[PDB]
């Protein structure tokens, strides 16, 4: 699409992850319902939400966002902000109708946030605040996310000027913290370990003498709530009360928790306790996430300093023995002695790194010997340097990195090469084709802080390391600790999948080879490309149950029709008859859909697998009658057959009237793709509209003075240009009327009348309103004779040119927008 956003960024945060590679289409669907005058420059996307020297999310005042929400952390930190609409079959009528959302708070794919506010000295101001904020339990979420739409910069409708809106919502890793309010007062500051930058968790600020807590799932005090979800972010439900300073910046301490300490000179190396006995040296070692490489940092108020306890051996503290003969400068682990030489002050510098200096001698700074990053080189104490070997990152440990559910796991080398389970015990890399044995159930174990990766087809088997024999990756029974995996998120959004019991061992695509059938290894961690994995949400019930038509992508006027010739299903001109409608129903056991004809319910769309490539209405129940809908980047679907997911139903070559559907190998071409009309849905027009021409947005359907005919005419804001759309649910069509005057069909080639006295069943007064994806506009097609559509006569846009009905060519003078008006 032309003039759309240059890249993904505006929607990279989406909770609806499948949405992220549909930038072009989403922008089109959002735009069609936005009149040129309402957004003269088109919508503005937040700039600079990501860096361009790292790609990382920018965390500063200017991009700090807030969301008021009544839902607690046990929900929000687990799920993120999921929109009210999550349907993969998106419609431009309501689901993506931004202005309706903004004006009505109607259900959509949108989730709103409000900018944090600061004065010209950079101190935080009272933000946009819901009117109910001092009543009962509400939360104030802190967000740093890629993209988002800048509403104020987008629109001129008089309004929260700080509203930033996210299509497809916001994933939980972009939520750093939240304030818990009980009746106006702040009671708690929650911090999310899983935030995208786990080394900025101690930059969270709030009022003094209010406790900060690191959240985990099912936190005992973590779902405090009252007895829709966007109520308190809706512009008319809040405002900016004033420009007061907020009570903040009241710690600047390291919160008591589990951390890793990483050197600035080499971030791959961490502070690690060598052994579990008194006087064991503390060394740098390559990070493999061992317990002895983790420390509990504990603050002392009175001394303004910290003790640092090893996690593997908690009775041992990171110590410098200032009472040694030899006067050693080395660091060791000793038991609690009472001395200040096991206390450290922790100061953050200009660039946001930490220096450790010993409390007993503050001139002594925590450093690596001679500035070496080599494994096992002792941690020492030394005098102040300009050197980066005495600068450290204090990183919050974080384990629950992905939500429980179904995923496809593929290699960074090639994201269409997925981990596939063949037979039961065997796993290998293979090209994706969206099958059950290519989908894995990841379930977190709260005790182990690690994941079981379970076969979807064979739940008894999980991904395991064959540690005692082949050292290969296999699938096996049992529930042993070495069948659990630590899933660590990298900066490039890939993951390391690390064995819980043998932490040197990670999932490794053998020799970095992406040839079909290549094996996986448990191999020593190096972090190279063949050890990095993409973990992508996969859902088998992508679409909702309902009554549907299948429109071909190439010609949306052609739909899948159960014909009377034998039982063959073919593409035919749409009439909205029963045999052209299908009930689509998900099956749990098959993880696939049955597509039963609405006229002939005993017949379901089926492939003649045994015999031929025929698509037809077949009786009974069988594997070849089940289909897996796979969303395409252009909003259409492809339907893989359960029996052979390499087969889909489409047409040979170009779809034309009465050519049979055929089962064929997936090819990605347009003749295999279908747009879904969900007849049964709630994406219907209600209220009053100016019906404007795609050719000229200021030219709109107008009832003439005599009230006899529809004409085209400049939008002059009159009663005769504001049409009520009255939806009839039985007919899937609209009456379009001004008072008792109805848009009324008078025959093909003829001027469209406006008629009084129309009966409820008079199909001449009924119109289908059909979105066309390729031309980006709506067809308005008569219900009495479905061959004819509203058409600006001769494509002449002079004032008073009649509207006629004519065959559909998808000409610009046959395409329409619906702009909300007043009644």
């Amino acid at each position: 699409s032309p003039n759309s956003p240059k890249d993904n960024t505006w929607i990279q945060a989406a909770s609806l992850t499948w949405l992220m590679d549909m930038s072009s289409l989403l922008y089109q669907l959002i735009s069609t319902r936005i009149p040129s005058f309402a957004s003269p420059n088109g919508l503005h996307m937040r700039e600079q939400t990501i860096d361009s020297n790292t790609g990382q999310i920018q965390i500063d005042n200017e991009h700090r966002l807030l969301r008021w929400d009544r839902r607690p952390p046990n929900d929000i930190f687990l799920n993120g902000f999921i929109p009210r609409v999550t349907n993969q079959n998106l419609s431009p009528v309501e689901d993506t109708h931004l202005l309706n959302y903004l004006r009505t708070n109607s259900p959509s794919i949108f989730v709103s946030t409000t900018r944090a506010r600061y004065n010209n000295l950079g101190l935080e101001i009272t933000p946009w605040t819901p009117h109910s904020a001092n009543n009962n339990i509400i939360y104030r979420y802190e967000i740093f996310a890629p993209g988002g739409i800048d509403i104020n910069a987008s629109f001129s409708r008089n309004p929260n000027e700080d509203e930033i809106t996210f299509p497809g919502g916001i994933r939980p890793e972009f939520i750093r913290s939240t304030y818990e309010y009980h009746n106006g007062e702040i009671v708690r500051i929650w911090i999310n370990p899983n935030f995208i930058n786990p080394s900025t968790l101690n930059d969270v600020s709030g009022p003094s003498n209010i406790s900060k807590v690191f959240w985990h799932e099912n936190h005992s005090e973590g779902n405090n709530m009252d007895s829709n979800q966007d109520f308190d972010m809706f512009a008319p439900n809040g405002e900016i009360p004033n420009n007061n300073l907020l009570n903040n910046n009241s710690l600047n301490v390291i919160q008591n928790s589990e951390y890793q300490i990483k050197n600035k000179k080499d971030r791959n190396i961490v502070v690690t306790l060598d052994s579990d006995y008194g006087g064991s040296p503390v060394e740098s070692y390559k990070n493999f996430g061992f317990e002895n490489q983790k420390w509990n940092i504990k603050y002392d108020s009175k001394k303004n300093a910290y003790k640092i306890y090893n996690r593997e051996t908690p009775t041992l503290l990171l110590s410098w023995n200032s009472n040694s003969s030899n006067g050693e400068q080395v660091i060791r682990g000793y038991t609690e002695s009472g001395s200040n030489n096991q206390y450290w002050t922790i100061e953050k510098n200009v660039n946001g790194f930490y220096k450790f200096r010993n409390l007993s001698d503050p001139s002594k700074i925590l450093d690596l010997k001679d500035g070496n990053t080599l494994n096992k080189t002792p941690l020492v104490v030394s005098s102040e340097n300009s050197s980066s070997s005495q600068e450290w990152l204090i990183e919050k440990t974080n384990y629950q990195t992905v939500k429980d559910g179904t995923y496809q796991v593929s290699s960074k080398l090639n994201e269409n090469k997925v981990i596939e389970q063949i037979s039961t015990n065997k796993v290998h890399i293979f090209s994706n084709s969206d099958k059950e044995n290519q989908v894995w159930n990841l379930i977190y174990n709260p005790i182990l802080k690690a994941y079981k990766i379970k076969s979807l087809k064979y739940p008894n088997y999980s991904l395991a390391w064959d540690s005692n024999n082949t050292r290969t990756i296999v699938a096996a029974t049992g529930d042993y600790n070495d069948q659990y995996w630590l899933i660590e998120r990298n900066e490039d959004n890939t993951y390391i999948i690390r064995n819980y019991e043998n932490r040197k061992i990670v999932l490794d695509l053998s020799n970095g080879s992406t040839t079909d059938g290549n094996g996986l290894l448990g191999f020593e961690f190096h972090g190279g490309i063949n050890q990095r994995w993409i973990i992508k949400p996969f859902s088998f019930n992508s679409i909702q149950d309902g009554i549907y038509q299948f429109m071909t992508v190439i010609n949306q006027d052609l739909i899948a029709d159960l014909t009377t010739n034998n039982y063959t299903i073919a593409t035919k001109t749409n009439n909205y008859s029963s045999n052209q409608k299908w009930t689509v129903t998900y099956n749990d056991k098959k993880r696939a859909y049955k597509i039963r004809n609405l006229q002939h319910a005993h017949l379901s769309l089926a492939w003649d697998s045994n015999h031929s490539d025929k698509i037809f209405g077949a009786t009974g129940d069988y594997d070849d009658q089940y289909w897996i809908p796979i969303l395409q980047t252009d909003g259409s679907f492809i339907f893989r057959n359960y029996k052979n997911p390499n087969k889909i139903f489409g047409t040979n070559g170009q779809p034309i009237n009465d050519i049979p559907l055929k089962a064929q190998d997936v090819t990605g071409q347009n003749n295999q793709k279908w747009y879904l009309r969900h007849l049964n849905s709630s994406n219907n027009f209600t209220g009053y509209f100016n019906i404007s021409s795609k050719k000229n947005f200021n030219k709109i359907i107008t009832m003439n003075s005599n009230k006899t005919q529809a004409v085209i005419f400049d939008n002059i804001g009159i009663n005769n240009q504001s049409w009520k759309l009255k939806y009839n649910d039985n007919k899937n069509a609209y009456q379009i009327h001004i008072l008792d005057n109805f848009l009324y069909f008078q025959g093909g080639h003829n001027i469209v009348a406006t008629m009084r006295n129309v009966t409820n069943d008079d199909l001449r007064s009924y119109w289908y309103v059909e979105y066309n994806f390729n031309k980006d506009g709506f067809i308005i097609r008569n219900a009495f004779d479905t061959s004819y559509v509203l058409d600006v006569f001769q494509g002449n846009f002079a004032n008073n040119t009649p509207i006629i009905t004519y065959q559909n060519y998808l000409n610009d003078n046959q395409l329409w927008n619906f702009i909300p008006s007043l009644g």
Side-chain angles (χ1 to χ4, degrees):
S1 60
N3 333 100
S4 58
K6 288 155 192 285
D7 59 59
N8 270 56
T9 304
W10 66 301
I11 43 160
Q12 264 182 202
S15 172
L16 306 181
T17 55
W18 46 267
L19 199 59
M20 283 162 86
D21 43 72
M22 301 168 78
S23 183
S24 292
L25 176 92
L26 189 67
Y27 181 86
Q28 178 186 305
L29 304 167
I30 301 173
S31 300
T32 36
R33 317 290 318 283
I34 302 166
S36 183
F37 95 105
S39 188
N41 312 141
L43 19 62
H44 189 104
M45 310 299 180
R46 278 198 313 162
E47 285 180 16
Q48 311 262 36
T49 59
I50 269 91
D51 202 332
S52 287
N53 301 251
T54 48
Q56 294 333 120
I57 278 70
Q58 275 275 142
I59 297 150
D60 46 60
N61 297 162
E62 196 156 354
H63 306 90
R64 197 161 161 265
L65 308 170
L66 307 170
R67 178 179 169 95
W68 303 93
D69 205 295
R70 296 268 169 182
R71 295 166 299 161
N74 279 9
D75 183 0
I76 301 303
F77 287 173
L78 183 78
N79 299 304
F81 292 114
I82 306 168
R84 292 172 62 203
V85 171
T86 71
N87 173 34
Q88 280 190 22
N89 184 35
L90 296 170
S91 167
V93 180
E94 275 297 310
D95 295 340
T96 64
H97 192 14
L98 191 54
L99 284 159
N100 200 77
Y101 165 78
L102 295 175
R103 277 205 300 284
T104 276
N105 208 49
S106 54
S108 80
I109 65 166
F110 305 111
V111 170
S112 287
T113 61
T114 191
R115 305 191 83 231
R117 302 186 68 247
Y118 297 87
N119 70 105
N120 45 307
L121 307 165
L123 293 159
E124 181 169 17
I125 298 181
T126 313
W128 187 93
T129 302
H131 295 332
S132 66
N134 304 345
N135 295 247
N136 306 127
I137 305 158
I138 197 178
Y139 291 89
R140 185 210 199 241
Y141 291 93
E142 186 197 28
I143 300 152
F144 299 87
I149 301 171
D150 181 347
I151 306 297
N152 185 58
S154 295
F155 298 110
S156 257
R157 86 280 173 277
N158 210 352
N160 178 2
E161 55 171 54
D162 285 315
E163 187 159 349
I164 309 297
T165 300
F166 287 80
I170 309 168
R171 292 191 306 279
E173 64 264 31
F174 303 118
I175 314 169
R176 185 169 68 173
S177 71
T178 194
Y179 297 167
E180 185 174 338
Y181 286 96
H182 281 217
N183 295 304
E185 327 277 298
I186 312 149
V187 295
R188 197 165 286 121
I189 301 168
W190 289 96
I191 310 171
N192 180 15
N194 183 51
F195 179 64
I196 204 74
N197 193 331
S199 83
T200 63
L201 296 201
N202 284 301
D203 298 330
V204 173
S205 47
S208 38
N209 210 119
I210 295 172
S211 75
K212 308 211 172 106
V213 7
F214 287 111
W215 178 88
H216 53 74
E217 65 154 29
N218 298 125
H219 196 291
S220 64
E221 272 92 1
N223 87 130
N224 299 343
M225 59 177 173
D226 305 331
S227 300
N228 73 64
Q229 72 202 39
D230 287 287
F231 191 83
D232 290 312
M233 282 309 297
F234 189 46
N237 292 327
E239 74 176 15
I240 316 173
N242 65 69
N243 300 302
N244 283 345
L245 301 156
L246 256 51
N247 189 351
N248 267 18
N249 313 148
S250 259
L251 286 199
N252 221 254
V253 293
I254 300 304
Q255 290 304 297
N256 297 355
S257 207
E258 186 182 63
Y259 296 96
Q260 287 200 288
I261 309 161
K262 307 192 174 176
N263 195 282
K264 191 202 182 187
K265 204 170 181 179
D266 196 341
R267 285 176 182 191
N268 301 327
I269 74 171
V270 289
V271 180
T272 139
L273 183 62
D274 192 47
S275 192
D276 66 357
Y277 56 77
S280 301
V282 168
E283 295 159 354
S284 66
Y285 208 96
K286 182 181 168 198
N287 199 4
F288 289 89
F290 285 109
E291 294 312 283
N292 74 342
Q293 290 179 314
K294 305 174 194 179
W295 305 81
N296 277 159
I297 298 180
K298 194 199 190 56
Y299 182 55
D300 191 296
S301 295
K302 279 161 292 170
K303 311 166 88 64
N304 184 32
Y306 305 74
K307 286 173 296 200
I308 308 169
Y309 302 87
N310 195 257
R311 277 258 26 201
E312 164 97 0
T313 317
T315 54
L316 286 181
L317 293 66
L318 195 148
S319 295
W320 172 57
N321 176 14
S322 67
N323 296 303
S324 68
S325 59
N326 306 346
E328 57 175 47
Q329 304 293 298
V330 307
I331 309 300
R332 321 174 96 102
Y334 286 108
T335 40
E336 189 103 36
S337 67
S339 172
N340 284 355
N341 67 33
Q342 309 175 297
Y343 283 89
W344 302 89
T345 60
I346 301 183
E347 300 160 339
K348 202 179 61 166
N349 61 25
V350 162
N351 328 84
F353 297 86
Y354 297 90
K355 314 268 275 207
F356 293 80
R357 75 214 298 159
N358 192 267
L359 188 63
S360 74
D361 189 326
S363 79
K364 295 305 169 85
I365 291 131
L366 193 65
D367 207 352
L368 303 167
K369 188 180 185 174
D370 295 319
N372 296 137
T373 57
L374 237 311
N375 278 170
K376 274 199 153 303
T377 65
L379 261 77
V380 297
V381 102
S382 87
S383 63
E384 193 139 42
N385 265 166
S386 50
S387 170
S388 293
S389 60
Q390 65 184 220
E391 293 193 55
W392 306 84
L393 292 165
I394 302 171
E395 183 183 310
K396 175 69 196 94
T397 54
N398 163 55
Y399 305 100
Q400 199 181 19
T401 221
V402 313
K403 195 169 142 170
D404 275 358
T406 43
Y407 295 89
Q408 210 149 283
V409 186
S410 60
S411 166
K412 178 59 171 159
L413 280 153
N414 194 322
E415 83 170 332
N416 269 225
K417 298 318 266 222
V418 296
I419 306 187
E420 170 184 285
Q421 193 199 18
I422 204 126
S423 56
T424 53
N425 48 354
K426 199 168 96 205
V427 325
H428 60 189
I429 206 89
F430 228 88
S431 290
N432 173 63
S433 58
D434 296 303
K435 27 213 266 266
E436 286 190 278
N437 75 350
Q438 292 178 330
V439 179
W440 299 87
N441 212 36
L442 282 53
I443 147 139
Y444 186 62
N445 178 332
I447 309 287
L448 253 43
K449 323 274 183 188
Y451 290 82
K452 211 161 194 204
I453 304 166
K454 297 162 77 53
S455 153
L456 196 59
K457 199 89 177 98
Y458 303 104
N460 275 314
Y461 297 76
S462 64
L463 221 55
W465 183 43
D466 188 20
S467 76
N468 306 317
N469 184 46
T470 61
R471 298 184 49 111
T472 280
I473 298 304
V474 304
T477 57
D479 193 46
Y480 295 105
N481 290 353
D482 61 4
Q483 306 181 265
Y484 285 84
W485 301 87
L486 292 161
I487 299 176
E488 314 167 332
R489 185 171 60 239
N490 297 315
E491 262 167 82
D492 64 5
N493 287 135
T494 70
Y495 295 88
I496 306 306
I497 307 178
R498 177 187 311 279
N499 187 260
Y500 176 85
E501 201 149 281
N502 307 279
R503 299 192 186 167
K504 282 192 178 209
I505 299 302
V506 302
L507 252 55
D508 177 297
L509 180 64
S510 185
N511 297 316
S513 171
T514 63
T515 154
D516 290 336
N518 191 38
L520 276 79
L521 305 173
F523 204 84
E524 176 154 346
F525 170 65
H526 55 62
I529 195 166
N530 63 309
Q531 290 185 356
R532 301 167 94 87
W533 301 92
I534 296 153
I535 293 164
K536 199 188 283 189
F538 190 97
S539 198
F540 274 108
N541 71 317
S542 45
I543 64 163
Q544 84 187 83
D545 292 0
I547 304 173
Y548 285 90
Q549 300 193 286
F550 305 80
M551 301 176 277
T552 73
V553 153
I554 283 153
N555 184 355
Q556 288 182 236
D557 288 4
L558 297 181
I559 47 83
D561 183 316
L562 172 57
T563 76
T564 184
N565 179 38
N566 205 13
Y567 293 90
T568 86
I569 300 167
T571 54
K572 280 165 115 290
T573 304
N574 182 34
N575 269 306
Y576 293 94
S577 31
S578 299
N579 63 303
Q580 304 176 307
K581 301 173 182 176
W582 308 76
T583 64
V584 175
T585 312
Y586 187 64
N587 186 338
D588 272 2
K589 288 76 186 279
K590 307 270 179 190
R591 297 165 181 116
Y593 293 77
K594 200 153 193 186
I595 302 164
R596 306 180 70 106
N597 189 263
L598 183 68
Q599 177 85 34
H600 300 274
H602 56 301
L603 313 173
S604 65
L605 198 148
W607 164 40
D608 199 353
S609 30
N610 285 312
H611 293 121
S612 169
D613 51 14
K614 196 220 272 179
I615 303 302
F616 77 120
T619 191
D621 186 72
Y622 217 156
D623 284 352
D624 57 19
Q625 322 180 6
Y626 283 87
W627 308 86
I628 310 159
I630 276 90
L631 186 61
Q632 306 296 291
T633 54
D634 62 6
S636 68
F637 285 78
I638 245 161
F639 294 88
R640 298 174 177 275
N641 190 274
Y642 187 57
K643 182 172 160 191
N644 190 343
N646 185 36
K647 297 290 175 195
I648 60 196
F649 67 86
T651 55
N652 242 43
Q654 295 311 110
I656 64 149
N657 190 57
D658 227 315
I659 56 138
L661 313 200
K662 291 287 185 155
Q664 26 168 0
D665 300 328
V666 277
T667 198
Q669 309 290 198
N670 277 344
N671 51 56
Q672 299 192 312
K673 295 154 58 187
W674 305 79
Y675 287 118
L676 297 175
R677 175 149 45 235
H678 187 196
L679 295 152
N680 216 225
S681 80
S682 56
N683 274 258
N684 311 296
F685 295 93
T686 58
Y688 293 90
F689 299 92
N690 298 150
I691 302 167
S692 80
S693 179
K694 188 199 182 60
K695 181 134 188 84
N696 190 331
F697 77 83
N698 211 52
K699 302 288 194 165
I700 72 177
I701 298 188
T702 301
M703 182 182 264
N704 59 6
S705 47
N706 288 334
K707 306 195 212 298
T708 51
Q709 302 169 340
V711 300
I712 206 68
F713 200 97
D714 302 324
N715 187 336
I716 46 162
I718 56 173
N719 289 293
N720 285 25
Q721 287 179 320
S722 183
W723 299 89
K724 181 74 154 37
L725 264 69
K726 182 187 180 148
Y727 186 62
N728 181 318
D729 193 46
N730 286 321
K731 291 182 187 298
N732 306 100
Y734 299 81
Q735 285 168 308
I736 302 170
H737 72 103
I738 296 172
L739 293 180
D740 57 350
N741 303 277
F742 291 77
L743 229 55
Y744 197 84
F745 176 72
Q746 294 282 260
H749 213 236
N750 299 338
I751 295 162
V752 183
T754 60
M755 283 275 310
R756 293 177 51 191
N757 284 308
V758 319
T759 73
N760 269 135
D761 285 326
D762 190 342
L763 293 182
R764 295 181 186 258
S765 69
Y766 279 97
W767 304 87
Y768 303 101
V769 181
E770 305 171 344
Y771 187 67
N772 185 279
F773 283 81
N774 156 67
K775 314 311 272 209
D776 192 4
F778 295 91
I779 297 155
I780 304 169
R781 175 194 304 287
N782 190 246
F784 179 81
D785 188 328
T786 55
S787 287
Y788 301 105
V789 314
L790 296 185
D791 170 308
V792 182
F793 168 56
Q794 269 182 347
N796 182 0
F797 283 83
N799 281 332
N800 285 302
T801 304
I803 313 291
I804 58 157
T805 50
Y806 203 63
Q807 290 89 339
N808 183 26
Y809 291 151
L810 300 168
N811 288 341
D812 289 346
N813 63 307
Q814 306 175 314
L815 287 151
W816 305 92
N817 315 286
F818 291 82
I819 306 153
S821 59
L822 275 156

